[PDB]
Design a binder for this molecule. Structure first.
Ligand code: HEM
Ligand code: NI
Ligand code: NI
Ligand code: NI
Ligand code: NI
Length: 460
């Protein structure tokens, strides 16, 4: 039964563009979803896309035989600095499968065991800082989670220390990164982006790229200026060869990979740890249930790989946090052939679909009526969750290659945070979600009162 595609207010030759003139476009797209239903068309000057919000429709969207990952306009803009990398490349492009096969073993279960030692190295530094704060000072959660995650990916992946905790204002790379993603977004708003009115936006943009590129040259420098025998992410980028083609990645792609993993490998993780702590301090005895498990399991000075893997309720909180507010709230898809979505909406070959992940996770027919409440107990048995009902890490082969990396780091850190500290909502903080393609709460502050539990000495 062919249904006609519903669509919000149109605005002349700008179509649906003036509907997103906020710094919270995704949150605006969510409000539209509650208004028009499970699917709606969003038209732009040169773009046409369809946002999905129901598990039923997204179920078929995740069918790889019918749909493949599409570069949305957001990703097409990120490709200006991410380029031929693993995040902003087409599936049919030569370098995706080439880099996928080379870098996938770097995220195997055996690789995760190797990262753990360095993950605790950075996680302890986080505890060190909070332990050494005077009683009056505030804890800036998103700023310090950014310090935690950036140092972690740089160390575990590239054997490189940003030393963000030894820095006052955020790392020069972070400033360039945030401004770049902030420039990728809002450019989605410009009707004529090539209008010279945004010339200062462009030249500021390619200055930030130069900064990111300068960092890459230094990571390669420290590596080639060896340096002990290594076996991390960068080691495989330089030496790894694709079994199917026998070739190693060319340097133009390698630099694109480093940029990709430096940004994609910490930004969304930082937001998650920020969102999680927010939902914990907002839900007291849920935080209590989680605080106990940390104290009950982590019975040593520093956590082990086995101990993090058995912090099961902590992972439930992280997933429930990923449910209500996925830090990567959308991924795009295109129809490989002509087909009919949900037996109602006909699609041309190449038509784009945007999976609005927050509204997916708020499907009342999947989770119930308490879609807004924070119940980590939903993830008691993951078996009881329908297929493609909960996808904060994308879909299929184009899914997040560092999902285990994030979840382990997010569990390891949050566990130590609950073991060593009690937390207080210093303000009656009202959630303000800042959008820079990704999602991260802004101006979130707390105060930690130590339990005075000592550490080890992070030796490995
Ligand atoms: C912590 C929360 C994270 C979330 C919510 C998240 C989300 C996602 C999503 C939705 C995709 C699919 C992109 C698309 O389909 O357009 C993706 C892919 C990817 N992610 Fe993550 N991610 C997270 C953490 C990480 C971490 C820790 C890494 C570490 C390297 C990482 C690296 C990547 C890479 C390289 C891809 C592209 C892989 C490919 O296309 O083959 N992400 N992620
Ligand atoms: Ni019918
Ligand atoms: Ni104060
Ligand atoms: Ni290797
Ligand atoms: Ni409870």
């Amino acid at each position: 039964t062919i249904k006609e595609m519903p669509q919000p207010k149109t605005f002349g030759e700008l179509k649906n563009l003036p509907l997103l003139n906020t710094d919270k476009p995704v949150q605006a797209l969510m409000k539209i979803a509650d208004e028009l239903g499970e699917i709606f068309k969003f038209e732009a000057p040169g773009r046409v896309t369809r946002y999905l919000s129901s598990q039923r429709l997204i179920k078929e969207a995740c069918d790889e035989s019918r749909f493949d990952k599409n570069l949305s306009q957001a990703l097409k803009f990120v490709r200006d600095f991410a380029g031929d990398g693993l995040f902003t490349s087409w599936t049919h492009e030569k370098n995706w499968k080439k880099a996928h096969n080379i870098l996938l073993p770097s995220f195997s279960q055996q690789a995760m065991k190797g990262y753990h030692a360095m993950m605790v190295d950075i996680a302890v530094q986080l505890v060190q800082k909070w332990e050494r704060l005077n009683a009056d000072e505030h804890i800036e959660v998103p700023e310090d989670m950014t310090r935690l995650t950036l140092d972690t990916i740089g160390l575990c992946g590239f054997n490189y220390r940003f030393n963000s905790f030894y820095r006052d204002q955020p790392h020069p790379f972070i400033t360039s990164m945030v401004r770049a993603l902030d420039e990728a977004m809002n450019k989605l708003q410009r009707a004529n982006p090539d209008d010279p009115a945004y010339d200062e936006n462009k030249r500021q943009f390619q200055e930030d790229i130069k900064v990111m590129n300068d960092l890459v040259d230094k990571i390669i420098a420290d590596r080639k200026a060896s340096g002990e025998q290594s076996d991390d992410l960068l080691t495989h980028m330089l030496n790894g060869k694709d079994p199917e083609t026998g070739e190693p990645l060319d340097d133009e792609n390698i630099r694109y990979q480093i940029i990709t993993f430096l940004i994609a490998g910490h930004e969304t993780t930082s937001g998650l740890l920020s969102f999680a702590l927010y939902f914990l301090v907002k839900n007291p005895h849920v935080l209590q249930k989680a605080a106990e498990e940390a104290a009950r399991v982590l019975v040593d000075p520093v956590p082990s790989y086995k101990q993090v893997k058995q912090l099961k309720y902590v992972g439930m909180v992280l997933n429930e946090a990923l449910r209500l507010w996925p830090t990567a709230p959308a991924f795009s898809l295109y129809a490989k052939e002509d087909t009919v979505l949900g037996g109602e909406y006909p699609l041309e070959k190449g038509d784009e679909l945007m999976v609005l992940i927050p509204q997916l996770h708020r499907d009342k027919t999947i989770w119930g009526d308490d879609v807004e409440e924070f119940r980590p107990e939903r993830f008691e048995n993951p078996s009881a969750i329908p297929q493609h009902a909960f996808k904060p890490f994308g879909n299929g082969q184009r899914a997040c290659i560092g999902q285990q990396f994030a979840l382990h780091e997010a569990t390891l850190v949050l566990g130590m945070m609950l073991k060593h500290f009690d937390f207080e909502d210093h303000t009656n903080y009202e959630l303000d979600i800042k959008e820079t393609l990704t999602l991260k709460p802004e101006g979130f502050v707390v105060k930690a009162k130590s339990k005075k539990i000592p550490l080890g000495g992070i030796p490995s």
